[PDB]
Amino acid sequence: KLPDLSMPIEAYIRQLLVDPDVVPIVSEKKKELRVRPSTRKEIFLINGTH
Amino acid sequence: TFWADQQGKIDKLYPQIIREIFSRVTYDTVVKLGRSKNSHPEKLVLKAIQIPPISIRPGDINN
Amino acid sequence: LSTMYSVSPVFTSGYMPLLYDLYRAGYLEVLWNPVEQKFLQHAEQREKE
Amino acid sequence: MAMQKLFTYIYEFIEYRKMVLLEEKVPYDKFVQMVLNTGFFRINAETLNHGIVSVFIFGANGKYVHHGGDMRTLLTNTLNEKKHYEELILIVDKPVLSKKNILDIIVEQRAANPTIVINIYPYHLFCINIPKVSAIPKHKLITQEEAQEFLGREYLQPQDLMQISASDPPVVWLGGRPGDFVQIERPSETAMHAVVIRFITKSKI
Amino acid sequence: IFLNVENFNFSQLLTDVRQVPVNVASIVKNILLSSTSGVLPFDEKSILQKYAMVKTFCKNLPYVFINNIQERLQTP
Amino acid sequence: LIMDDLVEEYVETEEENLVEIVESPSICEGFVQASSQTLVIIPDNERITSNVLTTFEATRLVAVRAQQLAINGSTMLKKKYSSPIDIAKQELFNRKIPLLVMRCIKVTPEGQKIVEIWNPREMGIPLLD
């Protein structure tokens, strides 16, 4: 737990997604921000589907 | 054993593949299908089985 | 009878415990017959025995 | 002899419900002629609460119980008039209660008009004076206040009571609805009659 | 009641005898046998009092199913 | 090659016919402890249960008292009895039993255990002697 701002934008958003309240928004077309959740995660697409 | 039939394309549904499939199911789908949140299909695939206490397997079931 | 038998009396509105105690020991006849002293001495004899 | 018994007993069913008759009463022969020609007979009754109760006596071989579309059209048309329409009663043959399609239109119409009560009943429900049957004990609806005081004294919920279906013939003749309470004076061979209160649940169909 | 019971049964006849918790006649017979009296003289007040006691006892009989407290309070 | 100890394969045939949304909070999933109850003792004048002990209640009272006299034995009885069972029976008959009878009328969803407390020393005793 307890993510850290030291790392670039990775493994601090990943650790953020460990919390169920923090849900991401995914586009499946943009390549800037790519993270892999540590565990199974529920997401929302950019249009709204869950 | 479960088999995936895609218009004759035959491929075996391994428990790892089934877990990958079941881990993509939302709790919204689980609830809307009449199942409890404790009955998520992700629990149907086990990577760590429980060996029972020796109290129920005295010194055959241990073979 | 309480001094001589385990019928330590209490009184309620319907005296239902009173009647129940008059049933276990016998002596339900006191409700309609004067007796009282008849089996009071019988109770003395039983306790003595 | 189903149609004769239906004709003689539906009107006492209406009267037992404390409903004033509407329109007029027709002879038996004209009744069966209408049943064979139009496919059904409609009886209109008015409740004490100024509502309207319509009884539809369909025929065993009528087209309205063989094609779902005809029944849908009839229900939509009848529900489209200007009447309070407290309850719709459709009396059909016993196998009609097994034909799933008709039951599906009945459910669809019930969902379409939630404030409107639609119930489909077999012939045998109105082929005898149900309250006068010897085997049937006296059923009576008790008001919600009496039921609440009874439950409060007994420390009970309405769901703890014994259940009774709203399609139960005595309950149908009483007009009880789900969520109501019925007091039943049942004969007893141990206490020489007894009183039981049952909770009215969802009617079968 | 027991003619209606006859109507929805095959061969269940109305009977004169019932299974009851208390045999009242036996109690009365025992009290009369144990009574140190017999053929009491006519007394209107006593007879009316006995009738009133029996009527009140019948009215308060269902209180054996609750308790003496509710009987004293005469709750519904 | 011949095995005798077969296991007799077992078959069940009658199937049963029982009749936002987020992952899980710390409330819906969990809280198996069940909320604590408060004891709502019905007032003595509002009690509706019998003022007579049932044979079950009297038997339980005597058994509890005799078991307690097995380890204890400080007794308020006058006459001396050589067994805890007799002592407990006489305590119940002499209305000296130090126990009470609680009859749980209802457990409410809000968390109330509505009970009637009855004193066996003011109750009818149905036991024999």
Side-chain angles (χ1 to χ4, degrees), chain D residues 121-167:
Chain D
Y121 293 130
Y123 281 148
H124 60 67
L125 207 81
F126 309 88
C127 271
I128 188 163
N129 210 301
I130 283 296
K132 269 187 250 284
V133 177
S134 100
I136 289 167
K138 247 39 163 165
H139 298 53
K140 165 197 46 163
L141 299 184
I142 48 161
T143 87
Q144 258 285 18
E145 314 95 57
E146 321 190 83
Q148 279 318 302
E149 74 94 13
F150 163 81
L151 291 167
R153 193 236 163 227
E154 298 282 315
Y155 270 122
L156 281 178
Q157 330 288 132
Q159 295 79 43
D160 292 338
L161 287 189
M162 287 102 60
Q163 271 135 17
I164 191 156
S165 159
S167 66

Tab-separated table of all heavy atoms in Angstrom, chain D residues 121-167:
chain	number	residue	atom	x	y	z
D	121	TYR	N	-59.703	-16.827	-13.954
D	121	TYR	CA	-60.198	-17.875	-13.080
D	121	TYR	C	-60.799	-19.010	-13.893
D	121	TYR	O	-61.332	-18.786	-14.983
D	121	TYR	CB	-61.259	-17.324	-12.117
D	121	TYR	CG	-60.717	-16.333	-11.113
D	121	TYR	CD1	-61.333	-15.105	-10.923
D	121	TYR	CD2	-59.591	-16.625	-10.358
D	121	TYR	CE1	-60.843	-14.196	-10.008
D	121	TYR	CE2	-59.094	-15.723	-9.442
D	121	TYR	CZ	-59.724	-14.511	-9.269
D	121	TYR	OH	-59.232	-13.608	-8.358
D	122	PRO	N	-60.730	-20.236	-13.386
D	122	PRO	CA	-61.343	-21.369	-14.082
D	122	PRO	C	-62.860	-21.363	-13.925
D	122	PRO	O	-63.438	-20.564	-13.188
D	122	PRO	CB	-60.718	-22.585	-13.395
D	122	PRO	CG	-60.378	-22.101	-12.034
D	122	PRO	CD	-60.005	-20.656	-12.175
D	123	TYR	N	-63.503	-22.279	-14.653
D	123	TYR	CA	-64.958	-22.367	-14.603
D	123	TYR	C	-65.447	-22.826	-13.235
D	123	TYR	O	-66.437	-22.298	-12.717
D	123	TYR	CB	-65.475	-23.311	-15.689
D	123	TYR	CG	-65.522	-22.702	-17.069
D	123	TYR	CD1	-65.317	-23.479	-18.200
D	123	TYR	CD2	-65.809	-21.357	-17.243
D	123	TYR	CE1	-65.374	-22.925	-19.464
D	123	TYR	CE2	-65.866	-20.794	-18.501
D	123	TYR	CZ	-65.649	-21.582	-19.608
D	123	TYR	OH	-65.706	-21.027	-20.864
D	124	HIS	N	-64.767	-23.803	-12.631
D	124	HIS	CA	-65.259	-24.404	-11.397
D	124	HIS	C	-65.275	-23.431	-10.229
D	124	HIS	O	-65.903	-23.729	-9.207
D	124	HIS	CB	-64.429	-25.641	-11.040
D	124	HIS	CG	-62.975	-25.365	-10.820
D	124	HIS	ND1	-62.507	-24.616	-9.761
D	124	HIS	CD2	-61.880	-25.759	-11.512
D	124	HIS	CE1	-61.190	-24.552	-9.817
D	124	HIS	NE2	-60.784	-25.236	-10.870
D	125	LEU	N	-64.611	-22.283	-10.354
D	125	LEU	CA	-64.615	-21.302	-9.278
D	125	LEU	C	-65.979	-20.643	-9.120
D	125	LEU	O	-66.328	-20.205	-8.018
D	125	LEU	CB	-63.542	-20.251	-9.539
D	125	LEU	CG	-62.960	-19.545	-8.320
D	125	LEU	CD1	-61.900	-20.417	-7.681
D	125	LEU	CD2	-62.378	-18.217	-8.731
D	126	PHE	N	-66.760	-20.562	-10.199
D	126	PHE	CA	-68.069	-19.917	-10.172
D	126	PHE	C	-69.189	-20.868	-10.575
D	126	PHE	O	-70.272	-20.415	-10.952
D	126	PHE	CB	-68.086	-18.685	-11.078
D	126	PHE	CG	-66.960	-17.728	-10.831
D	126	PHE	CD1	-65.746	-17.883	-11.477
D	126	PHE	CD2	-67.120	-16.662	-9.965
D	126	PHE	CE1	-64.712	-17.001	-11.254
D	126	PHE	CE2	-66.089	-15.776	-9.739
D	126	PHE	CZ	-64.883	-15.946	-10.384
D	127	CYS	N	-68.952	-22.174	-10.520
D	127	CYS	CA	-69.971	-23.160	-10.848
D	127	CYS	C	-70.697	-23.681	-9.617
D	127	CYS	O	-71.488	-24.623	-9.728
D	127	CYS	CB	-69.350	-24.322	-11.625
D	127	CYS	SG	-69.342	-24.077	-13.416
D	128	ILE	N	-70.441	-23.092	-8.450
D	128	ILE	CA	-71.105	-23.461	-7.208
D	128	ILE	C	-71.028	-22.261	-6.279
D	128	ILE	O	-70.128	-21.426	-6.387
D	128	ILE	CB	-70.462	-24.712	-6.558
D	128	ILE	CG1	-71.281	-25.196	-5.363
D	128	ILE	CG2	-69.030	-24.426	-6.141
D	128	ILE	CD1	-70.954	-26.599	-4.941
D	129	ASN	N	-71.992	-22.159	-5.369
D	129	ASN	CA	-71.920	-21.145	-4.322
D	129	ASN	C	-70.818	-21.554	-3.355
D	129	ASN	O	-71.018	-22.405	-2.487
D	129	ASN	CB	-73.261	-20.999	-3.614
D	129	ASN	CG	-73.493	-19.598	-3.097
D	129	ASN	OD1	-72.720	-19.086	-2.290
D	129	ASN	ND2	-74.562	-18.967	-3.560
D	130	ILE	N	-69.639	-20.952	-3.520
D	130	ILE	CA	-68.478	-21.354	-2.723
D	130	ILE	C	-68.698	-21.150	-1.227
D	130	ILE	O	-68.402	-22.073	-0.452
D	130	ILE	CB	-67.213	-20.646	-3.242
D	130	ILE	CG1	-66.712	-21.323	-4.519
D	130	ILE	CG2	-66.126	-20.628	-2.180
D	130	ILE	CD1	-66.270	-22.752	-4.320
D	131	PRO	N	-69.200	-20.003	-0.752
D	131	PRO	CA	-69.390	-19.844	0.700
D	131	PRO	C	-70.384	-20.818	1.303
D	131	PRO	O	-70.335	-21.052	2.516
D	131	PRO	CB	-69.880	-18.396	0.835
D	131	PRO	CG	-69.417	-17.725	-0.398
D	131	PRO	CD	-69.522	-18.755	-1.465
D	132	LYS	N	-71.283	-21.389	0.507
D	132	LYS	CA	-72.275	-22.324	1.018
D	132	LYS	C	-71.808	-23.772	0.973
D	132	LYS	O	-72.553	-24.659	1.399
D	132	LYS	CB	-73.583	-22.179	0.238
D	132	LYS	CG	-74.543	-21.175	0.840
D	132	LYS	CD	-75.884	-21.201	0.131
D	132	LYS	CE	-76.094	-19.940	-0.685
D	132	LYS	NZ	-76.454	-18.783	0.176
D	133	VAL	N	-70.603	-24.033	0.469
D	133	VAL	CA	-70.070	-25.389	0.463
D	133	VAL	C	-69.814	-25.831	1.898
D	133	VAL	O	-69.251	-25.079	2.705
D	133	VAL	CB	-68.793	-25.463	-0.385
D	133	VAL	CG1	-68.203	-26.861	-0.341
D	133	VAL	CG2	-69.087	-25.052	-1.815
D	134	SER	N	-70.238	-27.053	2.225
D	134	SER	CA	-70.099	-27.543	3.591
D	134	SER	C	-68.635	-27.700	3.983
D	134	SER	O	-68.253	-27.395	5.118
D	134	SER	CB	-70.842	-28.870	3.747
D	134	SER	OG	-69.949	-29.966	3.686
D	135	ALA	N	-67.797	-28.171	3.057
D	135	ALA	CA	-66.395	-28.416	3.373
D	135	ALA	C	-65.604	-27.132	3.578
D	135	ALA	O	-64.527	-27.175	4.180
D	135	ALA	CB	-65.744	-29.248	2.267
D	136	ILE	N	-66.107	-26.000	3.100
D	136	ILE	CA	-65.391	-24.732	3.165
D	136	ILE	C	-65.825	-24.004	4.435
D	136	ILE	O	-67.018	-23.699	4.578
D	136	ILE	CB	-65.660	-23.875	1.923
D	136	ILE	CG1	-64.961	-24.477	0.704
D	136	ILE	CG2	-65.207	-22.445	2.152
D	136	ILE	CD1	-65.410	-23.884	-0.607
D	137	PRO	N	-64.917	-23.717	5.362
D	137	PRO	CA	-65.293	-22.956	6.557
D	137	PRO	C	-65.526	-21.492	6.221
D	137	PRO	O	-65.203	-21.006	5.137
D	137	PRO	CB	-64.094	-23.136	7.489
D	137	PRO	CG	-62.954	-23.388	6.577
D	137	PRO	CD	-63.502	-24.125	5.388
D	138	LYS	N	-66.103	-20.782	7.185
D	138	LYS	CA	-66.450	-19.383	6.980
D	138	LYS	C	-65.192	-18.526	6.946
D	138	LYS	O	-64.454	-18.451	7.934
D	138	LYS	CB	-67.394	-18.908	8.081
D	138	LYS	CG	-68.796	-18.580	7.596
D	138	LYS	CD	-69.268	-19.568	6.541
D	138	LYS	CE	-70.774	-19.504	6.356
D	138	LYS	NZ	-71.208	-20.183	5.104
D	139	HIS	N	-64.946	-17.886	5.807
D	139	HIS	CA	-63.865	-16.925	5.656
D	139	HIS	C	-64.434	-15.517	5.739
D	139	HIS	O	-65.517	-15.244	5.214
D	139	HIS	CB	-63.137	-17.103	4.321
D	139	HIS	CG	-62.481	-18.437	4.151
D	139	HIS	ND1	-63.155	-19.629	4.308
D	139	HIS	CD2	-61.210	-18.766	3.822
D	139	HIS	CE1	-62.326	-20.633	4.090
D	139	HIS	NE2	-61.139	-20.137	3.794
D	140	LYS	N	-63.706	-14.627	6.405
D	140	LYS	CA	-64.127	-13.239	6.506
D	140	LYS	C	-62.894	-12.351	6.530
D	140	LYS	O	-61.928	-12.638	7.241
D	140	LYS	CB	-64.983	-13.000	7.756
D	140	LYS	CG	-65.150	-11.538	8.122
D	140	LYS	CD	-65.622	-11.369	9.554
D	140	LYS	CE	-64.829	-12.239	10.510
D	140	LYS	NZ	-64.991	-11.791	11.918
D	141	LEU	N	-62.932	-11.279	5.745
D	141	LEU	CA	-61.845	-10.312	5.727
D	141	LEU	C	-61.932	-9.414	6.952
D	141	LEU	O	-63.001	-8.883	7.269
D	141	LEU	CB	-61.895	-9.474	4.452
D	141	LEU	CG	-61.762	-10.230	3.131
D	141	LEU	CD1	-61.722	-9.258	1.972
D	141	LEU	CD2	-60.524	-11.111	3.140
D	142	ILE	N	-60.808	-9.243	7.639
D	142	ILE	CA	-60.716	-8.359	8.792
D	142	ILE	C	-59.940	-7.117	8.385
D	142	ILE	O	-58.977	-7.199	7.613
D	142	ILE	CB	-60.057	-9.052	10.000
D	142	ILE	CG1	-58.770	-9.758	9.580
D	142	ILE	CG2	-61.022	-10.034	10.638
D	142	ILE	CD1	-57.843	-10.052	10.733
D	143	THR	N	-60.370	-5.965	8.895
D	143	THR	CA	-59.735	-4.705	8.544
D	143	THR	C	-58.290	-4.677	9.034
D	143	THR	O	-57.880	-5.455	9.900
D	143	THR	CB	-60.507	-3.528	9.136
D	143	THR	OG1	-60.045	-3.273	10.468
D	143	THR	CG2	-61.995	-3.831	9.171
D	144	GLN	N	-57.509	-3.764	8.452
D	144	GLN	CA	-56.093	-3.681	8.787
D	144	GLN	C	-55.874	-3.271	10.236
D	144	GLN	O	-54.854	-3.627	10.830
D	144	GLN	CB	-55.387	-2.704	7.845
D	144	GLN	CG	-54.584	-3.369	6.734
D	144	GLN	CD	-53.269	-3.966	7.215
D	144	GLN	OE1	-53.066	-4.188	8.409
D	144	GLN	NE2	-52.369	-4.232	6.277
D	145	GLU	N	-56.815	-2.531	10.825
D	145	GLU	CA	-56.669	-2.123	12.220
D	145	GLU	C	-56.799	-3.316	13.161
D	145	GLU	O	-56.001	-3.476	14.095
D	145	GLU	CB	-57.702	-1.049	12.558
D	145	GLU	CG	-57.806	0.058	11.518
D	145	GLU	CD	-58.918	-0.184	10.511
D	145	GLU	OE1	-60.084	-0.331	10.933
D	145	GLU	OE2	-58.625	-0.225	9.299
D	146	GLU	N	-57.804	-4.165	12.931
D	146	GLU	CA	-57.962	-5.365	13.747
D	146	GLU	C	-56.770	-6.295	13.587
D	146	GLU	O	-56.280	-6.869	14.568
D	146	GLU	CB	-59.256	-6.089	13.373
D	146	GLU	CG	-60.429	-5.170	13.089
D	146	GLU	CD	-61.737	-5.923	12.961
D	146	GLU	OE1	-62.353	-6.228	14.003
D	146	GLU	OE2	-62.150	-6.210	11.817
D	147	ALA	N	-56.288	-6.458	12.355
D	147	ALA	CA	-55.116	-7.293	12.127
D	147	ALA	C	-53.890	-6.721	12.823
D	147	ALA	O	-53.093	-7.467	13.402
D	147	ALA	CB	-54.864	-7.440	10.630
D	148	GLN	N	-53.719	-5.398	12.777
D	148	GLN	CA	-52.574	-4.777	13.432
D	148	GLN	C	-52.632	-4.955	14.943
D	148	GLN	O	-51.609	-5.235	15.573
D	148	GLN	CB	-52.495	-3.295	13.069
D	148	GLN	CG	-51.863	-3.020	11.712
D	148	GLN	CD	-50.639	-3.878	11.453
D	148	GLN	OE1	-49.675	-3.850	12.216
D	148	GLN	NE2	-50.674	-4.646	10.370
D	149	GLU	N	-53.812	-4.800	15.546
D	149	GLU	CA	-53.904	-4.988	16.991
D	149	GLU	C	-53.694	-6.451	17.372
D	149	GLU	O	-53.056	-6.748	18.392
D	149	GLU	CB	-55.241	-4.456	17.519
D	149	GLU	CG	-56.462	-5.304	17.210
D	149	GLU	CD	-56.806	-6.268	18.328
D	149	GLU	OE1	-56.261	-6.108	19.441
D	149	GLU	OE2	-57.614	-7.190	18.091
D	150	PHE	N	-54.197	-7.380	16.551
D	150	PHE	CA	-53.959	-8.796	16.802
D	150	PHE	C	-52.475	-9.129	16.716
D	150	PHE	O	-51.949	-9.872	17.551
D	150	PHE	CB	-54.763	-9.640	15.812
D	150	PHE	CG	-54.305	-11.067	15.712
D	150	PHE	CD1	-54.697	-12.000	16.655
D	150	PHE	CD2	-53.493	-11.479	14.670
D	150	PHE	CE1	-54.281	-13.312	16.565
D	150	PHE	CE2	-53.073	-12.789	14.576
D	150	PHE	CZ	-53.469	-13.705	15.525
D	151	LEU	N	-51.784	-8.586	15.711
D	151	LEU	CA	-50.357	-8.844	15.565
D	151	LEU	C	-49.557	-8.188	16.681
D	151	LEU	O	-48.549	-8.739	17.137
D	151	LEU	CB	-49.874	-8.354	14.201
D	151	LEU	CG	-50.366	-9.133	12.980
D	151	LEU	CD1	-50.083	-8.358	11.707
D	151	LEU	CD2	-49.732	-10.510	12.925
D	152	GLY	N	-49.985	-7.006	17.128
D	152	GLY	CA	-49.293	-6.342	18.217
D	152	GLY	C	-49.421	-7.087	19.529
D	152	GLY	O	-48.457	-7.182	20.293
D	153	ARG	N	-50.611	-7.619	19.815
D	153	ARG	CA	-50.769	-8.424	21.022
D	153	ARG	C	-49.931	-9.693	20.950
D	153	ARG	O	-49.343	-10.116	21.951
D	153	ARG	CB	-52.240	-8.770	21.242
D	153	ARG	CG	-52.526	-9.320	22.625
D	153	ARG	CD	-53.200	-10.674	22.556
D	153	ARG	NE	-53.131	-11.378	23.832
D	153	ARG	CZ	-52.772	-12.647	23.967
D	153	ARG	NH1	-52.457	-13.391	22.922
D	153	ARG	NH2	-52.732	-13.183	25.183
D	154	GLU	N	-49.863	-10.313	19.774
D	154	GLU	CA	-49.153	-11.572	19.599
D	154	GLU	C	-47.664	-11.393	19.339
D	154	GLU	O	-46.953	-12.397	19.237
D	154	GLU	CB	-49.777	-12.369	18.450
D	154	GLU	CG	-51.225	-12.762	18.682
D	154	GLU	CD	-51.363	-13.950	19.609
D	154	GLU	OE1	-50.620	-14.935	19.430
D	154	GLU	OE2	-52.215	-13.896	20.521
D	155	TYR	N	-47.181	-10.152	19.234
D	155	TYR	CA	-45.783	-9.869	18.904
D	155	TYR	C	-45.384	-10.547	17.594
D	155	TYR	O	-44.347	-11.205	17.496
D	155	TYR	CB	-44.850	-10.283	20.046
D	155	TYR	CG	-44.590	-9.191	21.055
D	155	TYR	CD1	-44.895	-9.373	22.395
D	155	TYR	CD2	-44.047	-7.976	20.667
D	155	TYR	CE1	-44.660	-8.378	23.322
D	155	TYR	CE2	-43.810	-6.975	21.584
D	155	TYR	CZ	-44.118	-7.181	22.910
D	155	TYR	OH	-43.883	-6.185	23.829
D	156	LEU	N	-46.226	-10.383	16.578
D	156	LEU	CA	-46.062	-11.066	15.306
D	156	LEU	C	-46.027	-10.066	14.158
D	156	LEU	O	-46.587	-8.970	14.237
D	156	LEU	CB	-47.195	-12.071	15.067
D	156	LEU	CG	-47.139	-13.420	15.780
D	156	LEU	CD1	-48.375	-14.226	15.439
D	156	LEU	CD2	-45.883	-14.184	15.411
D	157	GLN	N	-45.360	-10.466	13.089
D	157	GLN	CA	-45.377	-9.788	11.805
D	157	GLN	C	-46.390	-10.437	10.878
D	157	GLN	O	-46.756	-11.602	11.059
D	157	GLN	CB	-43.986	-9.824	11.161
D	157	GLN	CG	-42.840	-9.842	12.147
D	157	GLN	CD	-42.659	-8.503	12.827
D	157	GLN	OE1	-42.537	-8.428	14.050
D	157	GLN	NE2	-42.631	-7.437	12.041
D	158	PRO	N	-46.877	-9.706	9.874
D	158	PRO	CA	-47.800	-10.321	8.906
D	158	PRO	C	-47.195	-11.492	8.157
D	158	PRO	O	-47.941	-12.362	7.691
D	158	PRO	CB	-48.136	-9.164	7.958
D	158	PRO	CG	-47.872	-7.935	8.753
D	158	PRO	CD	-46.709	-8.265	9.633
D	159	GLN	N	-45.872	-11.547	8.030
D	159	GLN	CA	-45.209	-12.636	7.326
D	159	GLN	C	-45.075	-13.893	8.172
D	159	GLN	O	-44.753	-14.954	7.626
D	159	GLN	CB	-43.826	-12.186	6.851
D	159	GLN	CG	-43.856	-11.085	5.802
D	159	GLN	CD	-44.113	-9.715	6.401
D	159	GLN	OE1	-43.554	-9.366	7.440
D	159	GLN	NE2	-44.967	-8.935	5.749
D	160	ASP	N	-45.303	-13.803	9.482
D	160	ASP	CA	-45.262	-14.979	10.340
D	160	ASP	C	-46.564	-15.764	10.315
D	160	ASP	O	-46.586	-16.918	10.755
D	160	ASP	CB	-44.942	-14.570	11.778
D	160	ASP	CG	-43.531	-14.046	11.934
D	160	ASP	OD1	-42.676	-14.371	11.083
D	160	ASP	OD2	-43.276	-13.307	12.908
D	161	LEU	N	-47.639	-15.170	9.810
D	161	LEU	CA	-48.932	-15.831	9.785
D	161	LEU	C	-48.961	-16.927	8.725
D	161	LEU	O	-48.161	-16.946	7.786
D	161	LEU	CB	-50.043	-14.821	9.510
D	161	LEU	CG	-50.402	-13.865	10.643
D	161	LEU	CD1	-51.651	-13.090	10.288
D	161	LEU	CD2	-50.592	-14.626	11.943
D	162	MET	N	-49.899	-17.855	8.893
D	162	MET	CA	-50.174	-18.817	7.838
D	162	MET	C	-50.692	-18.091	6.603
D	162	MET	O	-51.405	-17.090	6.695
D	162	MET	CB	-51.184	-19.861	8.309
D	162	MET	CG	-50.616	-20.860	9.303
D	162	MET	SD	-51.098	-20.516	11.003
D	162	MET	CE	-52.879	-20.618	10.863
D	163	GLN	N	-50.315	-18.597	5.439
D	163	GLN	CA	-50.572	-17.919	4.182
D	163	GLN	C	-51.811	-18.490	3.505
D	163	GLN	O	-52.194	-19.639	3.731
D	163	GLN	CB	-49.366	-18.044	3.250
D	163	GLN	CG	-48.340	-16.944	3.423
D	163	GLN	CD	-46.922	-17.472	3.465
D	163	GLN	OE1	-46.656	-18.607	3.071
D	163	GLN	NE2	-45.998	-16.646	3.940
D	164	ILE	N	-52.440	-17.665	2.675
D	164	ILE	CA	-53.554	-18.089	1.839
D	164	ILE	C	-53.457	-17.342	0.516
D	164	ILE	O	-53.117	-16.155	0.481
D	164	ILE	CB	-54.915	-17.854	2.533
D	164	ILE	CG1	-56.040	-18.550	1.766
D	164	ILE	CG2	-55.207	-16.371	2.700
D	164	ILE	CD1	-57.243	-18.874	2.618
D	165	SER	N	-53.723	-18.046	-0.576
D	165	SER	CA	-53.609	-17.449	-1.897
D	165	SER	C	-54.807	-16.555	-2.188
D	165	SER	O	-55.926	-16.814	-1.739
D	165	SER	CB	-53.493	-18.533	-2.966
D	165	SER	OG	-53.847	-18.031	-4.241
D	166	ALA	N	-54.560	-15.487	-2.946
D	166	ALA	CA	-55.655	-14.627	-3.378
D	166	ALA	C	-56.545	-15.299	-4.413
D	166	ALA	O	-57.641	-14.797	-4.681
D	166	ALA	CB	-55.109	-13.310	-3.931
D	167	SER	N	-56.105	-16.412	-4.993
D	167	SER	CA	-56.923	-17.212	-5.892
D	167	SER	C	-57.688	-18.308	-5.166
D	167	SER	O	-58.338	-19.129	-5.822
D	167	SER	CB	-56.055	-17.838	-6.986
D	167	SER	OG	-55.150	-18.772	-6.431
